[PDB]
Amino acid sequence: DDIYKAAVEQLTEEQKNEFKAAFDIFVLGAEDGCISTKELGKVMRMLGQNPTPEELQEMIDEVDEDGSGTVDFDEFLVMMVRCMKDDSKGKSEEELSDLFRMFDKNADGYIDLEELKIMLQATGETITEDDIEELMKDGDKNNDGRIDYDEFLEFMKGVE
Amino acid sequence: GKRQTEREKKKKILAERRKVLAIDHLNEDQLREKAKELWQSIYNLEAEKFDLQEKFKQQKYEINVLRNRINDNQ
Amino acid sequence: DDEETTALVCDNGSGLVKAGFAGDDAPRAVFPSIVGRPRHQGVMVGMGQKDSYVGDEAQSKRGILTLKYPIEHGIITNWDDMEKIWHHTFYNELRVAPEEHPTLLTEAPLNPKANREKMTQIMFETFNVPAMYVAIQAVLSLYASGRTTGIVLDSGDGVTHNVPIYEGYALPHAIMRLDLAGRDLTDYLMKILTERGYSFVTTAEREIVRDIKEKLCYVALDFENEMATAASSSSLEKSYELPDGQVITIGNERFRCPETLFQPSFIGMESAGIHETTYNSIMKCDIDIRKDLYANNVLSGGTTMYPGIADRMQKEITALAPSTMKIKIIAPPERKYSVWIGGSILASLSTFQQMWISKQEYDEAGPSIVHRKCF
Amino acid sequence: DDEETTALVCDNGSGLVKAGFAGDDAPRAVFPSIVGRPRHQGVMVGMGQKDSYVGDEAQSKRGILTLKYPIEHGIITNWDDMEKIWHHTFYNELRVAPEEHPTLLTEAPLNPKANREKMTQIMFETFNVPAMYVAIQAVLSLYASGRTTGIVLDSGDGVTHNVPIYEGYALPHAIMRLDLAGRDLTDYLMKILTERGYSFVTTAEREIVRDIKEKLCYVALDFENEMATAASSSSLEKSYELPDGQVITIGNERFRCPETLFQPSFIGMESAGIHETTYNSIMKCDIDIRKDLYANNVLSGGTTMYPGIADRMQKEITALAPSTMKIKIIAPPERKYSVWIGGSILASLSTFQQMWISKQEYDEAGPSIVHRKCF
Amino acid sequence: ISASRKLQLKTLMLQIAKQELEREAEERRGEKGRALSTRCQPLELAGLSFAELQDLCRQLHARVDKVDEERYDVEAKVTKNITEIADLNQKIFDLRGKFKRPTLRRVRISADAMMQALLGARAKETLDLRAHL
Amino acid sequence: AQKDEEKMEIQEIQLKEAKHIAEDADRKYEEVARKLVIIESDLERAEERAELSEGKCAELEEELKTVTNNLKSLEAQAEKYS
Amino acid sequence: AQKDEEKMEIQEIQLKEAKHIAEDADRKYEEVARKLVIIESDLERAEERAELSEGKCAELEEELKTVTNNLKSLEAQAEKYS
Ligand SMILES: Nc1ncnc2c1ncn2[C@@H]1O[C@H](COP(=O)(O)OP(=O)(O)O)[C@@H](O)[C@H]1O
């Protein structure tokens, strides 16, 4: 998403200090200023921060849609500073309970691919082939066709 | 048990809520306002009862979901 | 389903509680009726340990519990535990509040009055049902067979009773109730297993002996010949794996455990076997309905599921009865749930819909209403 | 951190004192529990020579000290030295005054009462803690594995004990405590090293033999084959450099030292090895929880860190146990600190927060409060 | 699978779901008002007299009794459901604890930070002790 | 003293190399631990599902045996009544 | 010169510790390699055998259905015979 400007303005010193240290480690001369994300990940690994890196490497293999491979500040800088948990409040548990109860038109304790497709047609998103399998992963942790409310809670918890 | 305490509490609530029974001793407007206010009160009580019924059905469904959870734990 | 109101056909039994809504083929939830408090100390904190596991939950944690049945011989000896069992049955195995459903309990013949009165008082005060009715466990088993005559031998797990019925008119002077049943067979099997070295003592291991009895024991067609054969060959020795290994081999204990039914002198009981109390129950009937009772002998109850009992009993009765009468033994494959199927059929009838003990009637006459016209 | 109050999870042990604040992954300070007075005369004046070096300081000046452990076999034999060790642990290794922190000591099973009562009396009178609680060293090791059942063999350095637990209900009649542990293995290794010419006698050189045992010894998968192989080839002889040179070569002493665990007849003990006391501890349990205990055998304690023990023990138990059961041995890589990790987890629980022995309770009932409900 | 597209789709779906829930709550409120107007028909007192007032008083007392009994039964049901909610909440708490309490811990609050001070402290202590002269 | 300074700097660069090797080994260790945890969890699930299948097979086999024997007996009786 | 020598001794001990780290890392890594391979092989075999049992169980289901139908037939014949 486009949180890039608010993020470059919003970071507080607890992570800004390490950002500056990583900047010093990164840029020592004869650099274009784009800050290559390949060296950035190694530098942050050297810093001792403990987020998840494999998603970042895959993203760089995909994200920055033009396929430049040298991410400018926004996206790879976010992936770097993603050590800190600036989440979307996790929403509210009661809100999601009310939503899931609303979605349970079957009134059988769970919502399956038919109801998900019904809601998607109600909103009108681009049809994805990752469907079915996404429900199997998130909601079907028991391989039984049953999905409780915590599965939907952790499906999009703190999503921006 | 679970048959007499409910009855006594209900009778006590009836006594405290059903006020003094006296109408024809006063003017038409005072009785008209009293009847209108009591009718609006019973309308509020009925609306609250139906809302609590819908909430009870929702919480019965939630209890069923939590039952399915405790069944999934075994 | 939808509008309308369905009846709850509960069936307390003694050993397995069978329940379900009226109008189906099989009970919805069948689970042992045992309530077991934990007996050790418990050191893990916050494990969420309850104070009493009832029903089928206590058949999985039975390693650290002391299971105790709340129903000894038909009668109920521990009312708090029975109330707990009923509460579990209504709320967790069926998930239907009892405030909106009639109930149809079942009771053995010739039981103490106080048991029945306390049962109805509980159902009306604690669970607060709209209306409940108590029925004799043998008439239902006769319903399920689709007959209208016949003498039914309902050998449950608590008590074996033998109610003869003709043309719908029960004969109250010919009911022969005998207190030998599946539980005594379990105890006798547990007692004769000690002759090979296997000692089961704990109340939890009684369940293991019960499983052995269910899976291995069978009723011999002729007792002496089987005793002679098992003492020479070894074609009978069937092995069984305990819940931890160490397989055991049951020899002539296989057909000696259920033989107690036909010779109650094995466990020291004086009375005659189930093969002779049926003939005595018939002979007390009038001289003109004995042929029909001979031809329509019905078996029911769990304990009559032993492989080979419908032939041994027929042979015995044919030996006792006059040579001209035809002896036929009805043994439906759905024997175990026969009483509950009959209960469902009875609760589904329109003619029966006005026999329930309505709550206002109980409020006017007290718990002693059950002995009155609403039987 | 900040406001609030954290608990001190101390763990006396016997050989290594492990301590740290509740809620972390590893103990903050781990140091040997030895107190050694100097033994020579001392001629330099003003050198600042103390009268007793405790903890890790006496493992560096051990050349002129006489180290003596204050805990022999679980029990504490020298209370003044133990008090000194505790004082050091609180003030110099953690630097937190005990007046503002609850403590959670640990104690082996089946220990003398007087030891536990004196421990609580010291903690409440001398150090003046707010509240302390004593826990059995095996339940914690079961906490750390994240299980709730299983039989845990906690072979420490003082005493090896084997506590079976099911569903959170400990079985007090099946605890098998054996007094063979790491210290006896050190003494036996020091005794068999003399067969090559190396003589270690001083109490300081016991530490060198302990280091040899830690770095070189391993448990053989099959004892006779290893004894035959080491007597023909020379592929086993591993060398080791003493604290002054003169390297030594250990031959078949490598797997003979830790073999004493499975054959306690080597050091003259009568009892059976740790491979057979676990099976005996299982067989004392009820017949229905033996499968779960077989499948969840847990190892803990320092001495179970020998390379190749989790396979030898599994082979032995599989030989003893019935062929159908599956034998699985849980050997987490963080074995040494398993008890302390479990202690941290237990102290961090909210449900446990009201089980501490509050000081006012001790003032009302005396030190004998520990045996009471607050266990 | 993408990263940005899934994020945006999930956010839009959550917002649309919240809007749908709010409009469904509003529709249910409208239907509840309609059912209020049915079960409790509004009374227009235009051109009214004493007799209709007294009839309203009697019918109102009878309906108050009936609805009070109905609401008492409903409230007893509500109390039972709340107790069941508490019991199920306690059970779910216990189960989530037996799941994730070992996983819920402070991993090396300061042990990770304290890495190299001990070695330097030992060496500098030896040197400072030697530094008497 | 000059020779000693030379040896000091050489050991210094060696020590830095040592620290880096240590960190690399540490990362490898964390990685392999993760992998082992995952595979063992899969082992648990595989064994349990195997057991379920085996038990169900046993039960169905027994029921087949019983019903088959009853059918055979009743067939013999059908011939008898013929 | 003496200060430099002290520095050298410190570097020596640190190098020793580093090599010690290397050895222990290698040993543990080889151990986990062994466990990984054994776990993987056993997982494969267990999945295979469980699927085999599942297939046999389905076959048993079909057999049981056949037997049930035939028993229904024989029962009807016997009752008509009666
Ligand atoms: N397949 C079987 N073979 C032999 N005995 C059985 C079998 N099933 C149940 N039983 C015996 O019957 C008892 C169950 O009888 P049941 O009819 O449930 O009693 P109740 O009349 O109380 O319901 C069990 O205790 C068991 O001993």
Ligand SMILES: Nc1ncnc2c1ncn2[C@@H]1O[C@H](COP(=O)(O)OP(=O)(O)O)[C@@H](O)[C@H]1O
């Ligand atoms: N890596 C190792 N290999 C073999 N033995 C060890 C190892 N680490 C410790 N030990 C033995 O274990 C003992 C430490 O055990 P520990 O668990 O600290 O005892 P306690 O239960 O008193 O804390 C040491 O005396 C040592 O003999």
Ligand SMILES: [Mg+2]
């Ligand atoms: Mg019965």
Ligand SMILES: [Mg+2]
């Ligand atoms: Mg220990």
